[PDB]
Design a protein around this ligand. Structure first.
Ligand code: CLA
Ligand code: CLA
Ligand code: CLA
Ligand code: CLA
Ligand code: CLA
Ligand code: CLA
Ligand code: CLA
Ligand code: CLA
Ligand SMILES: CCCCCCCCCCCCCCCC(=O)OC[C@H](COP(=O)(O)OC[C@@H](O)CO)OC(=O)CCCCCCCCCCCCCCC
Ligand SMILES: CC1=C(C/C=C(\C)CCC[C@H](C)CCC[C@H](C)CCCC(C)C)C(=O)c2ccccc2C1=O
Ligand code: SF4
Ligand code: SF4
Ligand code: SF4
Lengths: 160, 41, 130, 61, 171, 80, 739
């Protein structure tokens, strides 16, 4: 399909990889005894390996000639769960972190001892700001509009 | 317990607690839903 | 024991002057002490002052000045440093006008003074090929 | 400008250039740099105050 | 008693009078060496130094060279002799250039007195200054020293080769 | 020998002079500051370039500046 | 109002916990730049600059020692708890020669359960190379319940040491005179601590370890072995194994000590069953050590008209060559903690290295000689600890010289006379270092270039120009002849390394004569050269810590400073700290070469298997003798060859070793950013980053500053050491566990 890849559900090398891993795990399982915790752990390993391979097969995942899932990150929504949705999730979380950090910096920057409140965090104010970051996309595009997001010329510059 | 709570509010203790909590929920997500290569949806 | 009676009671160290302070220049520091205090040489180890005139020779001006700075801790202030060329060419160096450089004395003219801050320095591109 | 006034540093070779400081005292004598300004941010040497000329400081409204 | 004292009663020299720097054994041993033995012209000092140095220099080249032989070989001896002679030539070249760039004097122990008496108001470093009063510290003295080193090195290397051959053959 | 320049931002606090290890700087009368004194560099032939002078300078970007230049047995700190 | 302690000196309060940097006069005002944060940790334990009183520094040091001992006890309790709960110690007891010791199981997350290896005994976990199983077996511990109780005791002891530290800082802090009783302290540490510890351990060995281990070697399973207390209440369970307890303590009090030859032997060699030292020999050794140390503890005058005064001993040791001699050394070592730390750390690291040598040389634990990973790990770890401690001793000697050295109090004594001729010492040490390096390494390079040029007969090899270590071979011959000639009451040599028979346990070689040839000559001279260069750097740091021809007042700049300036042609790293930094680098080099020599020589010429007919086959096959004489040989037949197991560990239970190999490479390369660069570039880059932050109104109030020059060097050296040591750690562990 895309880039010459093929779905992993029809990739023979993918099933060969699964079979080889299961065979190695079973051979390891053979050298232990009865329902002893080592055998239980190896059986859990086998079950998890089978579940992971089955989930990857039924996941709209494209496999190359090596039988490994390749990620299609050109931007198409068909393979949108590989990069685009995790990209949105990370952008949300990281914007949350950056927004709460910036808000805390600007909030304790207007107190008597701004530097003290950076090594000794005001946990009440920190908790107040941190749970308010869920609106960071909206807060950012409400502070940029008011001109409160960017400094203009009070920023320092070197000699040249 | 007025200065002890202030000690717990210091940068190292707070960072250690936050990173321990963060690693904790990451590890537990990866335990309950392991081997997640793509978005579940 | 020693060449001169005013030398500090030092046992000699392999950190003193070398062939340079026999053909280029040597520095001598003189001072008078009330007590035979035990002090640390700028070159080696511990020496003993004389209860009176003290004279020490060094290879660098910095060594003599370090010794003098140590002397200030002994409430010794009259120390004076001279430069001796290969022959007996003595030149008083440190108390140049009899007053230490940290105290303002009349009769000193400013040397190396620019009537502007750092930002007034000329651009290097205008100082090419001169 | 006077004591307690807020000024912007116009000296380019300054750790507080384009920044705002608080005037501690403006000397009335014939010194070259009478304006003494105190800043909240220490410079690279650790100091937080410096003497500036009358044309190197601009009062903030 | 104390066996370490300031050198020549000067506590400011970078030196000490230890039982090795200023011992009678050290005095006599260094005064019998060619470099400091009294009554020797610079040519004689160079000749003796070259003889000794070539004599002990042929050894390592012949024994451990690229053409060794557990038995006696004329080729091994010739190789060691040639290597020693060429090394002496390199050392003589170094001596010659060092003397060329170091001194500008033809008769020492006088010029110092002349400029300490009749004044030295010139470009200095030739009239005034002048480090060392030995005859080895002149342009002429060092040239003869290098010549003696070179000739004595050749002669001593040849003598040592002959001795090595005799020892390996008749013993 | 190195080059040492003094600039009129000098406040005459003497910290440069009392930090020089080779007695290069000295305090001279002046009328451009409250202290009535300014640093001078009349013995730059002894300047070693250690820059202790400008480590003790409290003015914003320094009032004593050391420009390293040609080397000498005095400026190289050679005891030999 | 006791005469030794002060009661309630410091109030137990949490107020100062909320004020970081309260100890320092400079840091107490609060942070203004990020340099304050780093200065906070760099001055935490520098008690000299926190108080101006030696008494307060001593009390802080005493409580810090208590905290450290509590930490050590907690670590030991954790080890015993892991042995009790997460180990296969019981299975390893019944099959020491076929079960690999494991005492750490790994949780099944993110696929990391592959690290649980097939260590044997129906167990999965990480193979343990600390030798705790062998130590516990030598202690007579035959059950995991005993390990649990030892862990509980360790926890109780750790709490006790914590309480002791709190008590002796806040409730009853000793006075300076108590700390300065060096005669009493030496008497107690020599008699009580050392001698009585040896005596108590000899008692434990004789009554618990001797019978239990004898029964274990006889084949008795641990379940039917009597509980250890039964060997004390019943004089018949121990009198069957050692038929000399039937006479009781009467032979001891009647001076008929020959009767106790049953369990106090002098045999030498190794136990043929376990491959370790005879535990009867060990018990006799500890008894003799106890008596010797107890006797040695009655030397210094403490409170009666009896014993020696260390001041009078030192002051009487003058000489013609040494002026006043040791006069003033007693005042130096009783008023400066840094001098004591220097001596103790140097001798402590040297002792650690000696311990490392004697460990593999004479394996003291049952079934530890045939556990090659344990032997390799123990040697390498102890040598690393020794090198670090020696560098620390040099560092604290330099610190004493900078800070606590008084010129007036040391007029014409040994310290003064050493400083007075430091030039001669350093110049001759420089010449020796150049001579040794030229020779050792250039002989290596000559071998390499002769081999590369196809001239095999021109090498410094055994089949070529040969450099036989005749002096060491003479000593080896003297030791193998000692039993019956110079040690007439010995039955076997102290170690089979000096010569004798091949000792094998379960077809695996325990010890064997270590032949010394031209390959050992070169590597030994490499060791000497590296040690000499490290000594050169550290001694130059100590001697030139106060002054020099460059900076005549270097003592006024302190122990830790980056430079004096770009003048004098450049005065970088003139400190004494910058010498402990370079010396750390050279110690890493020396110890790395030492452990490489040990690993290759053991694998190639000691360790291996013995055929039933007596044929010895080694791990590598004797390639050390002919291929360790060239640098290409070290690169190929050792590094490249034995790195195969590390690089091929992916997918196996040793994959963690490959991951740590790669990560240690990454950290070592990361160090070079700090080691090669300078502060100005990073400060000017932080300037633009701060511009961006200010543009987005997110510039922190604590101004971010690049790490100071000294801290940049410290970070660089710490990362370099961590990366190199971790790379060697992963390489050694993977290689010696795979094969
Ligand atoms: C939490 C606040 C915060 C915010 C909003 C930003 C924002 C920014 N940083 Mg930044 N930074 C921060 C903290 C922050 N930084 C810290 C703590 C450090 C020290 C490690 C840096 C080091 C740093 C460098 C070296 C660079 C930036 C750069 C940038 C810009 C591009 C984004 C980027 O590369 O991220 C960079 C982010 C990191 C390197 C990791 C930050 C470390 C953690 C995640 C942040 C700290 C969280 C904090 C403890 C939360 C506490 C708040 C709570 C008490 C309420 C952007 C202006 C770049 C730039 O100038 O581009 C224009 C750049 O080169 N930053
Ligand atoms: C700090 C983050 C964090 C979070 C959000 C959770 C969340 C959870 N843990 Mg948990 N856990 C954590 C850290 C964390 N854990 C740590 C640090 C440990 C010690 C290593 C554990 C040990 C642990 C055990 C032993 C168990 C949980 C269980 C659980 C679940 C029910 C409670 C829940 C999903 C329980 C569970 O769901 O198992 C069935 C359970 O039995 N946790
Ligand atoms: C920086 C690059 C990077 C990226 C993009 C990833 C991405 C991923 N890694 Mg990975 N990893 C990295 C670096 C990275 N890693 C490094 C440096 C290491 C070495 C320590 C590892 C070691 C590692 C292991 C050992 C494993 C992964 C796994 C995973 C996958 C599962 C992620 C997960 O737990 O989601 C679930 C968790 C979240 C989405 C957390 C966010 C949830 C919040 C609470 C939502 C709340 C708001 C609504 C994912 C594809 C796992 C896997 O299955 O691989 C396919 C796995 O087993 N990684
Ligand atoms: C000081 C040395 C030391 C070290 C290095 C360890 C290290 C370890 N212990 Mg441990 N332990 C120690 C002392 C130590 N322990 C002591 C003294 C005790 C007795 C109380 C225990 C009792 C103990 C138990 C009972 C368990 C461990 C476990 C573990 C492992 C997982 C730890 C973890 O995720 O906790 C995370 C901790 C936090 C997030 C708290 C912050 C880890 C290898 C666990 C293990 O191996 O699981 C299989 C486990 O179950 N330990
Ligand atoms: C709850 C008990 C308690 C309380 C309230 C205090 C309170 C105090 N102690 Mg104290 N102390 C205690 C127990 C306690 N101590 C114990 C058990 C010991 C023995 C180790 C000491 C030893 C001690 C010394 C030697 C000193 C103090 C000092 C102080 C004062 C300042 C402490 C500070 O800011 O550092 C707070 C520091 C910490 C919280 C760091 C804890 C460090 C731990 C031990 C490291 C463990 C980490 C572990 C090894 C893992 C590493 C990875 C303060 C009054 C100082 C003082 O009064 O002088 C001005 C001082 O010099 N204490
Ligand atoms: C026979 C008596 C005796 C014994 C056994 C010890 C033992 C010890 N002393 Mg000690 N000491 C003694 C007498 C004694 N001392 C006297 C008389 C003085 C006064 C001059 C000192 C002054 C002194 C100082 C100043 C320091 C020590 C330190 C140490 C420890 C060294 C660390 C070590 O080797 O770890 C081995 C560890 C163990 C074997 C663990 C078990 C040891 C336990 C704690 C028994 C300790 C015995 C104790 C003195 C009994 C007092 C109990 C109390 C209720 C009165 C060690 C525990 C150093 C230390 O670490 O500080 C804590 C230290 O800095 N001692
Ligand atoms: C008995 C051992 C001992 C003791 C008591 C001390 C005590 C002291 N040393 Mg010292 N030192 C030691 C051993 C010791 N050292 C050794 C072995 C070395 C050689 C490396 C040194 C080298 C040394 C130097 C070069 C200096 C000191 C200094 C000091 C003083 C201040 C220490 C401080 O505040 O650090 C506080 C503690 C820290 C900053 C901890 C830093 C963290 C380390 C560097 C990294 C450890 C990594 C660890 C192994 C984990 C890595 C694993 C990774 C995967 C994460 C203090 C008196 C300093 C001083 O000014 O003395 C007056 C100083 O300049 N020491
Ligand atoms: C492979 C890299 C390397 C090498 C070769 C050296 C070599 C040396 N270091 Mg070292 N060093 C290194 C890395 C290295 N270092 C690193 C990374 C650091 C950073 C921490 C240091 C830090 C350091 C310090 C701090 C010190 C040294 C010292 C020394 C010298 C010890 C004396 C000696 O053996 O001289 C003999 C020279 C050699 C063994 C080099 C090879 C010479 C060959 C084998 C023989 C001669 C070849 C011949 C002349 C070639 C002629 C032909 C040619 C003209 C074409 C020596 C020059 C010490 C010193 O100054 O010397 C006493 C010292 O104090 N080093
Ligand atoms: C080894 C030489 C040795 O230790 O002899 C010992 C020699 C004798 O010195 P003293 O008799 O003065 O020592 C008496 C007291 O100081 C006891 O230490 O010490 C020296 O002279 C130091 C010179 C080292 C020269 C290095 C070669
Ligand atoms: C990068 C660099 C800096 C800048 C480095 C800085 C500012 C350090 C920043 C450290 C951050 C802020 C905290 C550490 C973050 C790590 C992720 C934590 C360590 C990892 C743990 C597992 C220990 C210097 O200041 C410097 C100075 C002198 C020589 C070389 C250099 C140099 O190379
Ligand atoms: S460099 Fe700076 S400090 Fe050193 S002498 Fe010249 S001026 Fe004085
Ligand atoms: S340093 Fe700057 S301020 Fe301090 S004295 Fe010299 S000139 Fe005046
Ligand atoms: S900065 Fe680096 S280079 Fe410049 S002086 Fe200090 S150390 Fe020497």
């Amino acid at each position: 399909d895309i880039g010459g890849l093929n779905p992993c559900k029809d990739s023979e090398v993918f099933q060969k990889r699964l079979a080889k891993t299961v065979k190695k795990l079973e051979n390891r399982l053979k050298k232990y005894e009865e329902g002893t915790p080592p055998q239980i752990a190896i059986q859990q390993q086998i079950t998890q390996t089978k579940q992971r391979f089955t989930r990857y097969a039924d996941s709209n995942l494209l496999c190359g000639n090596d039988g490994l899932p390749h990620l299609i990150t050109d931007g198409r929504w068909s393979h949108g769960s590989e990069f685009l949705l995790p990209s949105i999730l990370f952008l949300y979380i990281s914007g949350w972190i950056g927004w709460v950090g910036r808000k805390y910096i600007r909030t304790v920057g207007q107190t008597s001892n701004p530097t003290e409140k950076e090594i000794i965090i005001d946990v009440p104010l920190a908790i107040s700001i941190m749970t308010s970051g869920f609106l960071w996309p909206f807060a950012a595009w409400q502070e940029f509009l008011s001109g409160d997001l960017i400094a203009s010329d009070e920023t320092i510059t070197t000699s040249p | 317990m007025k200065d002890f709570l202030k000690y717990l509010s210091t940068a190292p203790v707070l960072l250690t607690a936050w990173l321990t909590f963060t690693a904790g929920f990451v590890i537990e997500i990866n335990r309950f839903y392991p081997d997640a290569l793509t978005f579940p949806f | 024991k020693l060449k001169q009676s005013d030398f500090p009671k030092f046992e000699g160290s392999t950190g003193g002057w070398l062939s340079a302070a026999k053909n280029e220049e040597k520095y001598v520091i003189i001072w008078t002490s009330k007590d035979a205090s035990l002090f640390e040489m700028p070159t080696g180890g511990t020496a003993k002052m004389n209860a009176g005139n003290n004279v020490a020779y060094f290879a660098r001006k910095e060594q003599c000045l370090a010794l003098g700075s140590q002397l200030r801790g002994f409430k010794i202030t009259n120390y004076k440093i001279f430069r001796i060329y290969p022959p007996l060419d003595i030149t008083l160096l440190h108390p140049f006008d009899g007053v230490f450089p940290e105290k303002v004395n009349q009769g000193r003219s400013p040397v190396g003074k620019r009537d502007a801050s750092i930002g007034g320095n000329p651009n290097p591109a205008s100082l090419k090929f001169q | 400008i006077q004591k307690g006034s807020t000024v912007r540093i116009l000296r380019k070779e300054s750790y507080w250039y384009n920044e705002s400081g608080t005037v501690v005292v403006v000397d009335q004598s014939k010194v070259r740099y009478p304006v003494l300004v105190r800043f909240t941010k220490v410079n690279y040497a650790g100091t937080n105050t410096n003497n500036f000329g009358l044309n190197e400081v601009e009062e903030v409204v | 008693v104390s066996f370490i004292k300031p050198y020549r009663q000067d506590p400011f020299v970078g030196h000490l009078a230890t039982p090795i720097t200023t011992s009678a054994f050290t005095r006599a041993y260094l005064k019998v060496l060619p470099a400091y033995r009294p009554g020797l012209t610079p040519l004689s000092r160079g000749a003796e130094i070259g003889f000794t140095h070539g004599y002990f220099l042929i050894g390592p080249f012949y024994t451990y060279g690229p053409l060794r032989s557990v038995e006696f070989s004329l080729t091994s001896l010739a190789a060691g002799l040639l290597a020693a002679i060429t090394l002496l030539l390199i050392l003589t070249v170094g001596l010659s250039i060092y003397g060329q760039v170091t001194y500008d004097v033809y008769d020492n122990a006088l010029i110092v007195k002349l400029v300490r008496q009749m004044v030295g108001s010139e470009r200095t470093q030739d009239l005034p200054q002048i480090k060392g009063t030995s005859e080895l510290d002149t342009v002429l003295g060092w040239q003869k020293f290098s010549e003696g080193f070179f000739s004595g090195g050749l002669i001593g290397s040849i003598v040592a080769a002959v001795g090595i051959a005799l020892y390996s053959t008749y013993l | 020998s190195h080059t040492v320049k003094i600039y009129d931002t000098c406040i005459g606090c003497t910290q440069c002079v009392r930090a020089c290890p080779t007695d290069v700087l000295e305090m001279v009368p002046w009328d451009g500051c409250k202290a009535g004194q300014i640093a001078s560099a009349p013995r730059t032939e002894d300047c070693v370039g250690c820059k202790r002078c400008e480590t003790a300078c409290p003015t914003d970007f320094l009032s004593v500046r050391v420009y390293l230049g040609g080397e000498t047995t005095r400026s190289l700190g050679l005891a030999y | 109002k006791s005469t030794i302690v002060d009661f309630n000196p410091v109030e137990t309060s949490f107020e100062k916990w909320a004020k970081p940097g309260q100890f320092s006069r400079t840091l107490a005002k609060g942070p203004k730049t990020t340099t304050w944060i780093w200065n906070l940790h760099a001055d935490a334990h520098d008690f000299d600059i926190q108080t101006n009183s030696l008494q307060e520094v001593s009390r802080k040091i005493f409580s810090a020692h208590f905290g450290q001992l509590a930490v050590i006890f907690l670590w030991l309790s954790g080890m015993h708890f892991h042995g009790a709960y997460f180990s296969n110690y019981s299975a390893w007891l019944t099959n020491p020669t076929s079960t690999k010791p494991s005492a750490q199981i790994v949780w099944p997350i993110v696929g990391q359960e592959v690290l649980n290896a097939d260590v044997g005994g129906n167990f999965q976990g990480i193979q343990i190379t600390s030798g705790f199983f062998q130590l516990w077996r030598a202690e007579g511990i035959t059950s995991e319940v005993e390990l649990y109780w030892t862990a509980v005791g360790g926890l109780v002891a750790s709490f006790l040491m914590l309480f002791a530290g709190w008590f002796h800082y806040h409730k009853a802090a000793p006075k300076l005179e108590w700390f300065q009783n060096v005669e009493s302290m030496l008497n107690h540490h020599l008699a009580g601590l050392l001698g009585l510890g040896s005596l108590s351990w000899a008692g434990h060995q004789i009554h618990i370890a001797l019978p239990i281990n004898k029964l274990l070697d006889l084949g008795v399973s641990p379940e039917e072995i009597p509980l250890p207390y039964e060997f004390i209440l019943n004089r018949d369970l121990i009198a069957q194994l050692y038929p000399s307890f039937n006479k009781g303590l009467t032979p001891f009090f009647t001076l008929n000590w020959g009767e106790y030859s049953d369990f106090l032997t002098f045999k030498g060699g190794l136990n043929p069953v376990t491959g370790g030292l005879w535990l009867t020999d060990t018990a006799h050794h500890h008894l003799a050590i106890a008596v010797l140390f107890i006797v040695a503890g009655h030397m210094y005058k403490t409170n009666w008209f009896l014993g020696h005064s260390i001041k009078t001993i030192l002051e009487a040791h003058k000489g013609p060559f040494t002026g006043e001699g040791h006069k003033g050394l007693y005042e130096v070592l009783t008023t400066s903690w840094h001098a004591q730390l220097a001596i103790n750390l140097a001798l402590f690291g040297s002792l650690s290295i000696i311990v490392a040598h004697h460990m593999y040389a004479m394996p003291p634990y049952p079934y530890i000689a045939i556990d090659y990973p344990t032997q390799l790990s123990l040697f390498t770890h102890h040598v690393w600890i020794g090198g670090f401690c020696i560098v620390g001793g040099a560092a604290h000697g330099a610190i004493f010289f900078v800070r606590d050295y008084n010129a007036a109090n040391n007029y014409n004594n040994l310290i003064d006379r050493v400083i007075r001729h430091r030039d001669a010492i350093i110049s001759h040490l420089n010449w020796v270092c150049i001579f040794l390096g030229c020779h050792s390494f250039g002989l290596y390079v000559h071998n390499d270039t002769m081999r590369a040029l196809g001239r095999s007969q021109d090498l410094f090899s055994d089949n070529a120009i040969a450099l036989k270590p005749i002096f060491a071979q003479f000593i080896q011959n003297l030791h193998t002849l000692a039993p019956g000639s110079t040690a007439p009451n010995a039955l076997t040599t102290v170690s089979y390394a000096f010569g004798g028979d091949v000792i094998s346990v379960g077809s695996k070689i325990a010890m064997m004569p270590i032949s010394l040839g031209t390959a050992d000559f070169l590597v030994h001279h490499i060791h000497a050269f590296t040690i000499h260069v490290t000594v050169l750097i550290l001694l130059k740091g100590v001697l030139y810590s106060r002054n020099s021809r460059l900076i005549p007042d270097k003592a006024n700049l302190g122990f830790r400073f980056p430079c004096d300036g770009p003048g004098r042609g450049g005065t970088c790293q003139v400190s004494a700290w910058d010498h402990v930094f370079l010396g750390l680098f050279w110690m890493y080099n020396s110890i790395s070469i030492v452990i490489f020599h040990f690993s290759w020589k053991m694998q190639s010429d000691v360790w291996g298997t013995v055929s039933p007919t007596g044929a010895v086959s080694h791990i590598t096959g004797g390639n050390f003798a002919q291929s360790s004489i060239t640098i290409n040989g070290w690169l190929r037949d050792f590094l490249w060859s034995q790195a195969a197991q590390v690089v091929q560990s992916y997918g196996s239970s040793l994959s963690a070793y490959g991951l740590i190999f790669l990560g240690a490479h990454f950290i070592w390369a990361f160090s070079l950013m700090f080691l090669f660069s300078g502060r100005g570039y990073w400060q000017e880059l932080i300037e633009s980053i701060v511009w961006a932050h200010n543009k987005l109104k997110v510039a922190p109030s604590i101004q971010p500053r690049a790490l100071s020059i000294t801290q940049g060097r410290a970070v660089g050296v710490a990362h370099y050491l961590l990366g190199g040591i971790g790379t060697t750690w992963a390489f050694f562990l993977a290689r010696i566990i795979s094969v």
